[PDB]
RNA sequence: CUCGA
DNA sequence: GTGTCAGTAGCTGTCACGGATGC
DNA sequence: GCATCCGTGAATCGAGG
């Protein structure tokens, strides 16, 4: 139960506010070893990690770090659900 | 007798006219074709007797419009010539089998001239390989049999247009000169009073800047056009006057952003029109426009090209026109009428076949090559260069790969029937690249047109959405080398019918009147009536005096496509009921045994033979060894030809293609004899379904409104009974932790259900296999990241994963063959593969509750229920009936033809016996001889638009043969009496009975029926699936949330919209809540609205939901 | 090579989560069949925060489980 | 009209600056998903293919910038960024679209939500539906107004969770996932405790078009042996549902409100006449009104 | 007429038809001829 | 506008050639002005909706 | 708006919205069934609900 | 693409 | 690292209608 | 001040390749 549903002109504070993080880097991902390069469309920094609790750099692997930010990756430990719901953005020069 | 040329059953024909012509290759469309797209002795020979004078192949032609190949000095130069082939890769069969595709390679003859050292190297190059058509005019891409589509595309040449204005009401005009290849022009009138062309879509300059830009003086001009207010207005609002003025005018809104140089715009507005660079109108082109304009009318056609002659003569024209003007003579030119043209009159649509839609494609391919190869010549040393140095025959391959395996006219072959596939070589497709879109065509493109006479069929083309865009070619069509389809027609001399035969074009064939087929001629060949209908340009039909006759019809048949001249008494049935008729004769699905039918049309046999699915003797012989998996053919000269017989092969539409010997051991037989027949035939002839005992009334309510009530007979005897062959498959490739193994040892499976796999994990053949069983065990590695928390548990408390090849939803039948590639034996497979296995799995099917049911009028319904024999409405002397067709559905719907089918039906089943004693009866006068006594169980043949008159069919109802006991059992009304086989009282009334051709349609229930309870869901939207192959639900429309809104099923509609759908955690939730018997508990949030939002939200839309306080929440 | 959005590629289909909430719904009635001290143990190195030996975790969790096999294999598993 | 658009930004409190972006937002990946192929190669969503073009322009805007590049190629550089920012939320809306493999217009995030394909009117305004079928049509004579005959096989599938409760119940089953396994490989029990299950169970057709409300009328269903669906032939009208091949899907309600809905509100006899005259419907129509 | 009809009716569009309306109740003006129709109405009470 | 020309035959006479190819333009437009006459109606239906 | 966004003019409508920052009322038969609450009709109603 | 009501 | 000419395919064979856009 | 030209819209579900 929500009464109203508002729509109006995004800021862009309010677009830098939503994203987790700038897309700075072109690159999708590795042909090779599928995984999303670092800053690229696919940075698990920014939208969320491929499998769930998995980061990057292979360091917690486990669901035991809940909420753990990753120090040689960057990544949080969530479910892939996020990768659904976590906005990116390009700042623009 | 009807088709007294192959060998075939004495099918007794009502005919009353001659066929002057007997019905050409039904397959010569593609065959000629593409004969001419590689220059065949064959069609080399019927262009050499047809008169031509230098035909070229379709190859040749390329290579001769490519050759020479030079740089900008000129002194190199390569040059193509003399395309052969090689033998054949692997045949048909084999490729088939291994997922390659069928073709030859290409060899032509390259050789490089040096002007600087005047010495030439040439040799021969591999150019590719190229795919080759099959003798039943499919090519096989991939394994798959594909067909390629006659295309209607509009002809090239000039063509003027009266339109007329919305606001100032007034007439303009308007032309287009649309070449083979290369920028298009059109000049205009609009409703200022002034003319102006536009230059490839580009903008409309004033139609003078033109006339400047070539060189021609203001003053000229003023002479040549100042009869026209019109034109003077144009010279005189122009902007800027010069010849080197208007020229850069033209240059800078051509291709605008560069330099304006007088050479650079002076070479390509002479290149883009007048080069054959980048211009070219092909020989119909050019002829199309030399009649048109009245020039060069006598000249050969060797100008390929534009001409400024042709511009001057076109504003002419069009000038003329605008002002009312009705004749015009170019200066030095016939004189000719001024007119506007149809663009769907058949003399300006064209129809390119297979060679040409080819052509363009190698065109492609090799005009990319030949920019590479002029790269490619200034780059390496001048000395050590060879054809196969420059040659780079990759775009090549890969223009005609992307021709093949992606193009609107490269079909995937309709094969549910061996008409089926025919009509499909047969098509007319309007849609495609360079011809136009769907969103593009107006009622007036799809109805049927005046010059489709003897064409195009007018009944054949579907009624979806695809109406009157795909029409099928009339019978005796043929296609001549400019594109344009010709029909034949016997010249009338001095109101005397002569056997002499000439194919006429549209455009020729309006410079005539030809007299309707069924006009009564003397023996000798004179008209009996002075007036006789005709038919006149522009689609007039009138009638006019016998003196008049040019030519007239050859069969009256002629009009219509070979499915539609299979529909007996055609000429009793309304189009819409006879366009069903004829598209669903190509869904009928071949029965295990096959019956030709009682009442034909004589189309069947060369139908059947010509659909290339039956057997025919190339050369007459005997029978050596006749076995059902060969039959071997001893010549006369002394060689053998052995044909093979296709067994339980599974056609494209997992219909059942099936061939039988027919001859046998020692038996003689003639060259082009049917010695083996397919799916849907019999001794010969289309035999698309069954002759049934029918009878007209309503039972019960069980054939309501065209439902239909059937004996259980036709399930016991399996009359109507059917196969099905389906093709599973899997794979085992390679994986990030392993790689699969296809593998009998399946974790937790039992050895029971294990019991019918060999110890590969492959089901064995023969076995009987239910839906969900396993065909193919293979078990791909788990990573143990992947496994969910009460997963982990379960395997702590007690690293494969099953991924096994079972059954689909709705299968069942016996495992017929396996096949197996291994890449570690030896079998090439997509790289990161190790192994494939396919399945076939073949059922029988009987005659069900629901399977759709059809005759040849349009007449279908499904199959509302199988009574037992006992329970059938039976004749007088015990026989019941087959089928029973409710009466209300049938004089609504205008298809009388069915009831003359059924009694000439039984006419043909009883046979009968005309009094011959005190002469021929009077209304028996007209049938032939051979008609006037007839044995129970006949052949006979109702031509269209020929054929048994009522009369004649109610004379053969009085003289029906007696049954074994001596009784006639139908009325000469055609009625019988029938006992109620359930009460046993006798029927109140008399029933009329007989015998129908019933097909059995390709839309059975154990296809069409589908459940889900749960399934997959789609990632994005995590609404479940669409299809029954992917186990999907039904669509719950905005039409169907209307309905629900209107009844006030609130609950309904939130049910269906949440928890049924994309509740992510209301699905769950549900689910659990039945196996646990606890209520259904509250929807939640349809996920797809969070995408909505996302979505809203990357277009820079802050969209909020507010709490009743006024927070924004999350 | 291809787009998702281009009309010829498949679609990302997600599983019927039909399994996984039966195993789990066994799971769960297998649980009413515990202590809360088994149950305070299995739903979590737990050792430091119940404030009991490891010793007594390893002994918990293997007879919990032993205890969890029991009810399950007797349901049919 | 100015004003219309004016007093907007002066009421509302929100800027106008809104309009001109300095930073573009990025969907998540899962809206822009990139798919493996069965040859080994990839397939990857236009949203993705549009975002790039735009990241390599603002990158090289970047470098232009710091590079100090002629004023012409900085100029000529953001006129291209702006186009392909303008690609990405409505692609083709100015001049020519940006053409993909094949001269194809590429989908844009504004494509994703017009029209018949768009998010409203495909995924919002109607979804597809769990515990639903469908099949061919039957007329079923002996059938009273308010029953209706599917296959059984159907409805198996259809009340696959309820006969898996019902199995474990009576004991044919050990435990509920041994149902599941029994109910797949159709073991013979079903058959005679799937009648317990779908007992005055309310079901609901439509039939295609809906055009109006009695598209959709509800049912008691009547296990048939068979695969196809018996229809009452009275209902024919309100569906316009000949018997040459038509189909109808079948949807279960599950709640039991939704049971109660169906019950009351949509069973066919309780739907005779046609709301948008009040004649009737559901009376002798073809063959009946002759035998009368 | 036609469902073209019913859709310039429920659109409010500005019909072809484009048949007018007497805006005062008053005497009616036939002034007839054939290069044009021109009609004036008297209003029946006061009115111009 | 009607053709001057009518079709004499009824069904159970036989049409002629003649007589059927013309019917057929009819009989096809009559299928192809259908569906766009319920294109339009559908989208007329939901405008009122 | 949504009921507006979702019948025609998308995109012309979405525009609008966001410039005079509209409020949408959840309170309508079209904009519940996009979002899954009940209905404001038949057993939708308060009376009954 | 082809097709069914 | 790059250096003589070195230059889309495709396409118009939809239409009614309203109103901002533009001369 | 008015004609041009831009943008909007154009039935529902279903099968297979």
Redesign the interface.
Known sequence: ????????????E???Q??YGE????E??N?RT?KPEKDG??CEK???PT????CYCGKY?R??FKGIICERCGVEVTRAKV??????????? | SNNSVPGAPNRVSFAKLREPLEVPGLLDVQTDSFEWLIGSPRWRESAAERGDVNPVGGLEEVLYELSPIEDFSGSMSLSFSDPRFDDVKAPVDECKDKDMTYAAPLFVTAEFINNNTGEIKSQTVFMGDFPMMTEKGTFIINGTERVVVSQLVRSPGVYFDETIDKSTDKTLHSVKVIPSRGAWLEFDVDKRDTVGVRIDRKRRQPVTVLLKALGWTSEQIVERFGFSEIMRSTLEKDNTVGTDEALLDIYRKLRPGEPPTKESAQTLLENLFFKEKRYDLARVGRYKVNKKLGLHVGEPITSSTLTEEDVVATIEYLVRLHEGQTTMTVPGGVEVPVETDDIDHFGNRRLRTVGELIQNQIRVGMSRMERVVRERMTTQDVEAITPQTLINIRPVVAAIKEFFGTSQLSQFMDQNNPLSGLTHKRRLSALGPGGLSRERAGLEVRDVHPSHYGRMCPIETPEGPNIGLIGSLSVYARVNPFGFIETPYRKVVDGVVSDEIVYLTADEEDRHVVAQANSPIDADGRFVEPRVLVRRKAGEVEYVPSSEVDYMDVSPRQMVSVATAMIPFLEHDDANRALMGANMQRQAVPLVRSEAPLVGTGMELRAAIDAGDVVVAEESGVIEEVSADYITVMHDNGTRRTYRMRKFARSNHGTCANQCPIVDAGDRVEAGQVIADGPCTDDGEMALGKNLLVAIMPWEGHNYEDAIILSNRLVEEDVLTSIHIEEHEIDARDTKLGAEEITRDIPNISDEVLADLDERGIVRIGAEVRDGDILVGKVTPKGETELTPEERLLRAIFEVRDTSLKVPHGESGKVIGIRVFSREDEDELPAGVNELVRVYVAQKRKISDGDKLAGRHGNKGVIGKILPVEDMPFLADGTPVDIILNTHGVPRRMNIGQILETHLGWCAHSGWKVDAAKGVPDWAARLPDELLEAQPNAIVSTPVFDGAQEAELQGLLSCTLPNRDGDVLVDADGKAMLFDGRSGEPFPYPVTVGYMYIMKLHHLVDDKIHARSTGPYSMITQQPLGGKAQFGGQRFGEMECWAMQAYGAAYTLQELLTIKSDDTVGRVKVYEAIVKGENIPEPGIPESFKVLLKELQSLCLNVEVLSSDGAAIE | VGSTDQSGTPEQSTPDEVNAALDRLLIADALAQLSAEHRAVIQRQIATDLGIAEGTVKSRLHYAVRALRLTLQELGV | KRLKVVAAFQQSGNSPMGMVLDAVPVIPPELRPMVQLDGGRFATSDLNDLYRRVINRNNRLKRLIDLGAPEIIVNNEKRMLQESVDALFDNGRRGRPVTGPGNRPLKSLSDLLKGKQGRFRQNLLGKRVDYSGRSVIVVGPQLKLHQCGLPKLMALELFKPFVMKRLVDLNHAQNIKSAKRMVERQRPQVWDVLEEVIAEHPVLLNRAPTLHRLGIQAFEPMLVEGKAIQLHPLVCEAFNADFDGDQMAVHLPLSAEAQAEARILMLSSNNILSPASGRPLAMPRLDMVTGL | GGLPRVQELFEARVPRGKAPIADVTGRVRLEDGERFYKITIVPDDGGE | EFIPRPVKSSFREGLTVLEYFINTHGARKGLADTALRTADSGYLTRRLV | WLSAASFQETTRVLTDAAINCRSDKLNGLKENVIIGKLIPAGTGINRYR
Not at chain 1, 23 to 26: D, G, M, N, T, Y
Not at chain 1, 51 to 54: I, K, P, Q, S, V
Not at chain 1, 84 to 93: F, K, N, S, T, V
């Open positions: 139960f929500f009464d109203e549903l508002r729509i109006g002109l995004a800021t862009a309010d677009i830098r939503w994203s897309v700075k880097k072109p999708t991902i042909y599928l469309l696919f920014i939208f969320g499998r769930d609790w998995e692997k669901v035991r990768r659904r719901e976590r906005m990116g953005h390009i700042e623009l020069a």
